[PDB]
From a paper:
The first committed step is BCKA decarboxylation by branched-chain ketoacid dehydrogenase (BCKDH). Branched chain ketoacid dehydrogenase (BCKDH) controls the rate limiting step in BCAA degradation, the activity of which is inhibited by BCKDH kinase ([name])-mediated phosphorylation. BCKA flux through the complex is inhibited by E1α phosphorylation (Ser337 in the full-length human protein) by branched-chain ketoacid dehydrogenase kinase ([name] or [name]). BCKDHE2 makes up the complex core, and [name] and PPM1k are thought to compete for E2 binding to regulate activity.
Herein, we identify the thiophene PF-07208254 as an allosteric [name] inhibitor with improved potency over BT2. Through structure-activity relationship (SAR) optimization, PF-07208254 was identified. A surface plasmon resonance (SPR)-based binding assay was developed with PF-07208254 showing good agreement between binding Kd (84 nM) and functional Ki (54 nM). The superior potency of PF-07208254 relative to BT2 may be due to improved protein contacts with non-polar side chains in the binding pocket or polarization of the sulfur electron density. Thiophene [name] inhibitors BT2 and PF-07208254 disrupted the [name] and E2 interaction as demonstrated by reduced fluorescence signal with IC50 values ± standard error (SE) of 1300 ± 290 nM (n = 26) and 56 ± 26 nM (n = 5), respectively, which were similar to their in vitro inhibition potency values. These [name] degraders are therefore also destabilizers of the [name]-E2 interaction. Binding of destabilizers to [name] increases flexibility of the LBP residues, creating conformations that either destabilize or prevent E2 LBD binding. This disrupts the interaction of [name] with the BCKDH complex, exposing [name] to its natural degradation pathway and decreasing protein levels. PF-07208254 has a similar efficacy profile to BT2 and promotes [name] degradation, which contributes to sustained BCKA lowering in animals.
Author numbering:
A (entry chain A), B (entry chain A): 26 to 47, 53 to 306, 332 to 374
Write the structure that this text describes.
Amino acid sequence: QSAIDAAAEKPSVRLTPTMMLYDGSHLLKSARYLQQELPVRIAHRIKGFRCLPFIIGCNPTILHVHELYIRAFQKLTDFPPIKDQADEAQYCQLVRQLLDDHKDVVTLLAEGLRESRKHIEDEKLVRYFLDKTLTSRLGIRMLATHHLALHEDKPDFVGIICTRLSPKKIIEKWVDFARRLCEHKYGNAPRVRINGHVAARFPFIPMPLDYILPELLKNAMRATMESHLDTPYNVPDVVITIANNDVDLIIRISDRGGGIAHKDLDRVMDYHFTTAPMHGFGFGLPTSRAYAEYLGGSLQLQSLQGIGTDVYLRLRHID
Amino acid sequence: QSAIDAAAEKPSVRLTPTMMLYDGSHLLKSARYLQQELPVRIAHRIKGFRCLPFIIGCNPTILHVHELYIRAFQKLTDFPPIKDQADEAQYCQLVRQLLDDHKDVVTLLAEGLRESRKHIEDEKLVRYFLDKTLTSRLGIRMLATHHLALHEDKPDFVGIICTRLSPKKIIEKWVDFARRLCEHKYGNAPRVRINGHVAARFPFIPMPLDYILPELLKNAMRATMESHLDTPYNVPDVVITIANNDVDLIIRISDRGGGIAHKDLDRVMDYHFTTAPMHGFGFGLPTSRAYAEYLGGSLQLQSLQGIGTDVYLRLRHID
Ligand SMILES: Nc1ncnc2c1ncn2[C@@H]1O[C@H](COP(=O)(O)OP(=O)(O)O)[C@@H](O)[C@H]1O
Ligand SMILES: Nc1ncnc2c1ncn2[C@@H]1O[C@H](COP(=O)(O)OP(=O)(O)O)[C@@H](O)[C@H]1O
Ligand SMILES: O=C(O)c1sc2cc(F)sc2c1Cl
Ligand SMILES: O=C(O)c1sc2cc(F)sc2c1Cl
Ligand SMILES: [K+]
Ligand SMILES: [K+]
Ligand SMILES: [Mg+2]
Ligand SMILES: [Mg+2]
């Protein structure tokens, strides 16, 4: 479509998490902003699918995701200008439907690429496509969820921004989730100890942490159980340190799971790479790093082969 | 001198720590090897001084070190071929004298460069000169000390190679040294806990660890005391983890000393850089990294601003 070609050239206007902390006229300004911003971001994704190597773009699962993005651009651009609160309520129902229609895009992309990637000349190309597609999708989802959340009245929240986020509380929520998955598979899970700036509270968007934290915790718990198959009733603790400063929030997850082997170290950050249904599909580590870098931070690993691994998640503060 | 020009072109023949684990005829073969190898390594250092920027090479302290290296090449090349045990005993006395004559070369280089570096166009140049000079000097010293040590009969030692090196024991020797320096300055020192592969024993050359370990321990202890000036009677422990695998030995030193600030992070590995007589002269960190890389390993830092720093020393095993 020619409409897609016009918007794929338009530059995306990035919204700062600080800018987001800005009658009902504010919901209209937000919906109108979204209606200008979303089609441009969708069009840049469509350009990405059009630029995929022919043999990969031809995959029926990859074609399905490409078609979904075209459909999202069509539905968003065909929506009439939002003049009043009634149009704004209709818009919310469309954004909510598109949020659900695209809930499994990461799963579908992994399936489509799984076999087709093995037929290409550039290994770096698929990593670039996934880093760009998944981080842009995360940005689209945060914008969409923020607008819908501006209608709710949660205490300590302005849309998706938590004004008093406690890292200890959000880590504990995901430790409980990971211990349950771990206990279901092994009958036992490593005890998690949290130290450092346990009392820290500050404005923050939980959404990225809601993806990254269960991933890293599942990895630390699985490694601990797999390295202690001979004593599953006596496994070492996972230790989490919170460090909070004016520049960034640092979360260190240290495990005693044997470390990442020297042979595997240069492949752990590749998509699809896994040494394994509790783990995933080899997307946890590369996706979490792309998300952290997209949000002005980083994801770094330090392997102590024979002992364990320290993972450092760094996320920039809201200004 | 023209003799220096001829040997500065000759390639150095690197001796593997494994090759070193090879009547009195073996001392002669070693002294004869040294007599061919040392002048070439000394000549490459002289070439380095000749290539220093004119304003830096002119410094009287830098000129003194340049002259010392010329003198070492002259004395080693003028020494007559070693035919017997008597010539070999005379050679040992010269190597021992040169080891003492050059004991302070790192101190003299730091002094000479301290002011003169501030008059140059290439910042990277001084780092390259120091990394190359200090690591080559370390290689010269290990060769010289190994030959002299082949005359001694220490149990568990073939020259300078320890056949059953315990990382826990060598770390404890340097923890005692650092706690004494720390207790003398503050009246108290952080307690050091050692965990991981505490029972590990393997062939290893202690000499590089004898430089790196007191440096990193002095840094961890100083940072802990400087960050707890309000409670000097209650400071947090320094935690050392030993990880031993077939490829390398990893030693992690974790402190609760507040971390390395974001402003200072990109300068801590520069020579002369210090935030400070117990510390040194800003050479500890860059020298330790150059030494670790020279020996097929690495020195990496992870800063948790507001909490502490984790330092990872990795050293390749003897094959
Ligand atoms: N804490 C850890 N300890 C040991 N191995 C780990 C750890 N974290 C990650 N790994 C390794 O990295 C591989 C890839 O990780 P990831 O991308 O998250 O996908 P998956 O969870 O599906 O295996 C894992 O299969 C595992 O071998
Ligand atoms: N463990 C640590 N914690 C905090 N700061 C550290 C640590 N290790 C090194 N540093 C910082 O790095 C700087 C440079 O270190 P170094 O090169 O070893 O020289 P020096 O010991 O003379 O200060 C120190 O002055 C200090 O600010
Ligand atoms: O890929 C996604 O996850 C999503 S969620 C969403 C909501 C919209 F309004 S468009 C859109 C897209 Cl394209
Ligand atoms: O710079 C040094 O530390 C040394 S020690 C030593 C022993 C020798 F035989 S030459 C020589 C040099 Cl050049
Ligand atoms: K992976
Ligand atoms: K320094
Ligand atoms: Mg995972
Ligand atoms: Mg030091």
